Amino acid sequence: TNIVTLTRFVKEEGRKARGTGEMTQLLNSLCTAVKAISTAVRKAGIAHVKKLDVLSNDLVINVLKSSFATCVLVSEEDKNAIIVEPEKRGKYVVCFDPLDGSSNIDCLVSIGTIFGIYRKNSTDEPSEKDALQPGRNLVAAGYALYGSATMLVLAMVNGVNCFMLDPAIGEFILVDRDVKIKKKGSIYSINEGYAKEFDPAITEYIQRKKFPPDNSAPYGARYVGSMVADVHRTLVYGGIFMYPANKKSPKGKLRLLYECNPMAYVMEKAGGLATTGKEAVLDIVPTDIHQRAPIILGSPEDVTELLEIYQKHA
Amino acid sequence: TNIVTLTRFVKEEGRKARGTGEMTQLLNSLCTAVKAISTAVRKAGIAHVKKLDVLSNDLVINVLKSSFATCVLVSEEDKNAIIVEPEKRGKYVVCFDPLDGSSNIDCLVSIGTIFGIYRKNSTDEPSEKDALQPGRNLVAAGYALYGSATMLVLAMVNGVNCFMLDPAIGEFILVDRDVKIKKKGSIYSINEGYAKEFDPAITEYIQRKKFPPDNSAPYGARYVGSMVADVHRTLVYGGIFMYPANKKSPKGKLRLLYECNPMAYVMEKAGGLATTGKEAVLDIVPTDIHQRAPIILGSPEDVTELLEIYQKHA
Amino acid sequence: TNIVTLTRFVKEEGRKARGTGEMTQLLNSLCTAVKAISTAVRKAGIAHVKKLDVLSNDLVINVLKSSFATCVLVSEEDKNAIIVEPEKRGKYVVCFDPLDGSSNIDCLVSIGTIFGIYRKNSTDEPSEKDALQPGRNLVAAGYALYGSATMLVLAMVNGVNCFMLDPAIGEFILVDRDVKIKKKGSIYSINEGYAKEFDPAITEYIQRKKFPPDNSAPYGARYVGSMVADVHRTLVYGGIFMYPANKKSPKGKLRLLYECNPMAYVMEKAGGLATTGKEAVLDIVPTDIHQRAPIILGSPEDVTELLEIYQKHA
Amino acid sequence: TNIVTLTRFVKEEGRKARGTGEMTQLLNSLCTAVKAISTAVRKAGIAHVKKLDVLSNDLVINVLKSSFATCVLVSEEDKNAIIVEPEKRGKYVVCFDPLDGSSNIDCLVSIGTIFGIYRKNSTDEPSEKDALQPGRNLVAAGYALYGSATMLVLAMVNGVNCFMLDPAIGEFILVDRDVKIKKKGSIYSINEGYAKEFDPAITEYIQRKKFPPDNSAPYGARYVGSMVADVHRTLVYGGIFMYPANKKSPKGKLRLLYECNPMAYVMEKAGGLATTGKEAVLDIVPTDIHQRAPIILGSPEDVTELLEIYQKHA
Ligand SMILES: O=P(O)(O)OC[C@H]1O[C@](O)(CO)[C@@H](O)[C@@H]1O
Ligand SMILES: O=P(O)(O)OC[C@H]1O[C@](O)(CO)[C@@H](O)[C@@H]1O
Ligand SMILES: O=P(O)(O)OC[C@H]1O[C@](O)(CO)[C@@H](O)[C@@H]1O
Ligand SMILES: O=P(O)(O)OC[C@H]1O[C@](O)(CO)[C@@H](O)[C@@H]1O
Ligand SMILES: O=P(O)(O)OC[C@H]1O[C@](O)(CO)[C@@H](O)[C@@H]1O
Ligand SMILES: O=P(O)(O)OC[C@H]1O[C@](O)(CO)[C@@H](O)[C@@H]1O
Ligand SMILES: O=P(O)(O)OC[C@H]1O[C@](O)(CO)[C@@H](O)[C@@H]1O
Ligand SMILES: O=P(O)(O)OC[C@H]1O[C@](O)(CO)[C@@H](O)[C@@H]1O
Ligand SMILES: [Mg+2]
Ligand SMILES: [Mg+2]
Ligand SMILES: [Mg+2]
Ligand SMILES: [Mg+2]
Ligand SMILES: [Mg+2]
Ligand SMILES: [Mg+2]
Ligand SMILES: [Mg+2]
Ligand SMILES: [Mg+2]
């Protein structure tokens, strides 16, 4: 038998890259941590803010620490930036959310790990300074969906690729590439509990989805509650996902460095779009490692519609 | 080591039941089919209306056919009712949805199997006639959530019990019992794409959730798109789930026999409620095996609120 | 898909048996314990007279204790016979070796669980008295080989059947039945370290295997060191297995109740033979629960050859 | 959590090596193929000279072919040497036995993959010429035991290390290092069916093991029938393993390049010894890729004893 492995896939690409490939042992060190996570999660009740939320976070760090490719780490789970010591230093800064949606593990709701990889280009000894660059400085990014199946969407400068983990061989087999997203969708996904809090554009948009001006049949609504779940659905059947700013929290809820920025690199890399409503999520220069941002991503056409609105209203 | 297995759990209950226990080899024949399903689904991309949708449906029938406990089967996937031939006949009629949400497998969205078990009490040779009884005639019912973990909630006359499948030992280990649902929740889950189509009560209700009359902070909104997913979330953190009638399809979308009725037996058995808005889902006498019904279930208090509305408006 | 499960297989046989089937929940309670064992063993180094040797022994007892089919248990790992208390009593006495060959786990040598099941026919409150009957009083017996694959050979009054555990579905799928053993083999398996200790027959036999009197090409020699491994090889390619008496230990080394007797029920049930050299292992009336016996089993023709010798010499 | 992975282990060693590390993606490409093999084998009966014997052989080649580290491959399963084409060429020549002991898979006997890695040092376009070097030119070698657990012993210039595959995470976790073998053992393992065929030394040796001249208690005898099984036992509890020349086949049965040579690199690297009786297996310059050699390996002291004999007799 032949083909295929992520590793077998990444390396073959970094050949023509043509690269020193430490990127490869990074995604490897990463996959292992992902495989460990995937197994822990399918047996949460047999194993008895969440415990593993801690558990994964380390788990992931330790694999990254020992990949010999990283020099600065950012975990949605750490006060400050973790610096890789001199023996194990690599040329990569990796931002990640060890386990997104643990606030909702209990529903056997799908959850996942989000990551972004920047090449530290500084010559200075590493520090947070290196972890605050624009999204557009991503060499590689993606996530890991621990759903009915454990997938991993990886986007790199070339395009978007999907890998499903075959539990038995403990390998991530490439099952789709290079993914691209329908130009227009039939779905809007947003937490409408905040109807009260939303701005006019969002309000008018949603309105436009429920009652088509032209009267086309109305969009669907899906909101799972797990970002990595929602986007991916969005990335597959297209559509749009919204976690916009609300007056109470002006900058949304999703952390840009490890949550918003990556989903964007992916979205844009698959033909999608990612905006705050005010600007491309990716061109935002961050000042705070844990700073948040509102986010509107998905099918290029739908995202525009919203934008035209936001523009209309500003 | 000791404890625990469903089987080890059911049998111990049918002892004081005190029963002939064929119910037991039914849930066994069932679990096997569930374990087969769970594995197929975690490797859908490596395996390449849905193919398995057929696959599971048989798979499930064959295990039930050979449980020697069943005499009539109803699959959301079959024109007519399947009758178990004389050699393999049991005293049970089992209604089920082999794989709910396959219309959404592609998102590694959680999916599942829903089932209901009636004791054929007739003395007539079996037929569909036996599969159309009120929900209240359920000896046992529940579902199987193939999410990040593969759980199985089983409700029986006594109460509601939850089992997580430990992948390694291929066993369903009891991880929660006897489940009961918060009396009031912080969530409403409904497809709002149909805002246009909904009736006044539903409309006014949702309105009341977004902007609290008393001004309590508004509910959350979650809609995953997979019934078995949504309810279970509902059953765990409580709340409410709605797939109400809309003028276009006056009786909702979810099939009562294999989808609505079971979720109700469960809901009510855990302290919840299940109404069409007009009546308890369970007291509906069905005329058509594949007949549908609208459904409002979840936290007892929330469900009432809606009801008081429906009453208010009728 | 359809077929096949042990359970699905045993039950279908106890139907025409036609039985009350508690035998079934016994092999079920058993299989679970076997599945637990199989998993522990494939990860012994990751888990860090042997520890599990204890572990399995309980594990097995607890499943048997709760099968509600047993009333007296014999473990190569217990000073006295375990009596099942009144609430959980069944009509079966089960003799077993939780984990044979743990003295050799370290070589990732194959190891296994050996069991025998007698129907207590007494009307007396149960006790060891019930666990000491002739082999010929076995209702069911077999073993579990935890090798490259985890098989389970089960022999019952009808014939011999083999089941391989499919790790994924946690089910024992029937892969061979009804097994029968070549009438003559090309192999002898015996620990020749004891050349010094062996009697003349054994000595002359072995001699006859290395240098054919007629000059046919000599037998093979295989000795793995794990009884359950050796016999099964013997049962598959036929041949003969010997652990005969030696002057130092006149009655061999293998314990009759849980080790020798079962292998015999199996052997004879597959067309093989099992002798001490003096008599059929099965007709021996035991006085001591932990009493041993020498054992010569395998291809009917080979076993005879040895016997004719033993006879020749006595 | 932290530690440990082979990869995580090899790479850390090739750092101080300090190497270009393609050796690493070789053992990786290798492990994958090993994981694929391990799974196929534990479900041989559910999957229905051997079929997989072919299957593995390719499987292994394809992973090696795509490791980008190899330039010439030798499979006990191929007429001639496989040359890696220009795009995928690496600086390594890898000799291997895809699946040793398939002649004995049927007994759920343990089986395995044996490999040896030479650095092609030639400047010539690659060919078999490169695959025929002395054992002493091994950069890395080892095997994979698919027994009750799936281990992998890897020996490299530094010492011998053992890795057990944790089925769940699909990772080879280091469980022992750096292995060394008892200086003397209590076991001899040899196929005595060939008593007739053996030479005087072998004969006298065995004789000396059954009846101690000094009268120490006699050795044990173990012969599993699977080389990778037997040696490893030998490597763990020490002892000695013999597959010596017999007049009928003067050069033994085990193929030096892929079977004998590696077991030696390992043995000697763990403090053991490996001789034909005439010379160190490792210093033999091969002329034929598929050429065989007799082999005597194991505890240093025991091996000598035999040697002193061979010397005594020549
Ligand atoms: O130099 P490295 O370690 O190969 O990293 C660069 C990698 O990043 C990429 O730009 C995509 O992530 C590839 O071109 C290449 O594989
Ligand atoms: O419950 P809310 O306010 O809609 O926020 C849910 C969001 O939070 C997360 O759980 C992470 O904070 C995401 O998975 C999801 O998009
Ligand atoms: O007679 P049976 O086959 O045991 O079935 C009855 C079972 O149904 C129950 O009412 C619950 O499903 C239990 O009392 C009992 O285990
Ligand atoms: O997409 P809609 O119209 O909200 O319906 C989704 C419903 O359909 C189902 O997929 C089954 O028909 C359920 O899982 C879910 O509740
Ligand atoms: O009465 P039970 O519980 O079915 O046990 C008897 C079983 O034993 C057998 O003799 C074989 O073990 C079968 O005839 C039958 O399945
Ligand atoms: O090492 P010896 O003396 O040959 O005995 C090995 C025997 O002991 C056992 O390990 C059980 O006592 C069997 O598996 C095997 O037949
Ligand atoms: O140059 P490479 O690709 O790292 O290969 C050399 C490897 O071989 C070794 O000699 C052992 O196999 C190590 O020193 C080193 O890891
Ligand atoms: O059956 P024999 O002649 O002892 O040879 C067995 C040998 O053959 C092999 O199966 C490989 O040829 C080895 O595993 C084992 O050492
Ligand atoms: Mg987190
Ligand atoms: Mg998060
Ligand atoms: Mg269906
Ligand atoms: Mg459905
Ligand atoms: Mg034991
Ligand atoms: Mg034993
Ligand atoms: Mg081979
Ligand atoms: Mg071979």
Give me some keywords for this one.
homotetramer, 314 residues, alpha+beta, Fructose-1,6-Bisphosphatase, Chain A, domain 1, D-Maltodextrin-Binding Protein, domain 2, eight-stranded mixed sheet, 13 strands, 32% helix, binds 6-O-phosphono-beta-D-fructofuranose, binds magnesium ion
Can you walk me through this structure?
Chains A, B, C, D: Belongs to the FBPase class 1 family. Chains A, B, C, D: Its EC number is 3.1.3.11. Chains A, B, C, D: InterPro entries: FBPase_C_dom (IPR044015), FBPase_class-1 (IPR000146), FBPase_N (IPR033391), FBPtase (IPR028343), Fructose_bisphosphatase_AS (IPR020548). Chains A, B, C, D: Mg(2+) 1 binds at residue 76. The structure is a homotetramer of 314-residue chains. With 314 residues, chain A is α+β, with helices and mostly antiparallel strands. Chain A has two domains: 1-178, Fructose-1,6-Bisphosphatase, Chain A, domain 1; 179-313, D-Maltodextrin-Binding Protein, domain 2 (3-Layer(aba) Sandwich), CATH 3.40.190. Helix content of chain A is 32%, strand content 24%. The first copy, chain A, has helices at residues 6-15, 22-41, 44-47, 51-65, 200-210, 227-237, 256-269, 300-313; strands spanning 70-75, 82-83, 92-100, 111-119, 138-146, 150-156, 160-166, 171-179, 187-190, 220-221, 240-243, 273-275, 295-298. In chain A, the strands form two sheets. In chain A, strands 2-1-3-4-5-6-7-8 form an eight-stranded mixed sheet, sandwiched between helices. A five-stranded mixed sheet of chain A has the order 10-9-11-13-12, with helices on both faces. In chain A, helix 1 (6-15) packs antiparallel against helix 2 and helix 5 packs across helix 8 (300-313). The interface between B and C is medium-sized, with 27 and 27 residues. The structure holds 6-O-phosphono-beta-D-fructofuranose (8 copies) and magnesium ion (8 copies).
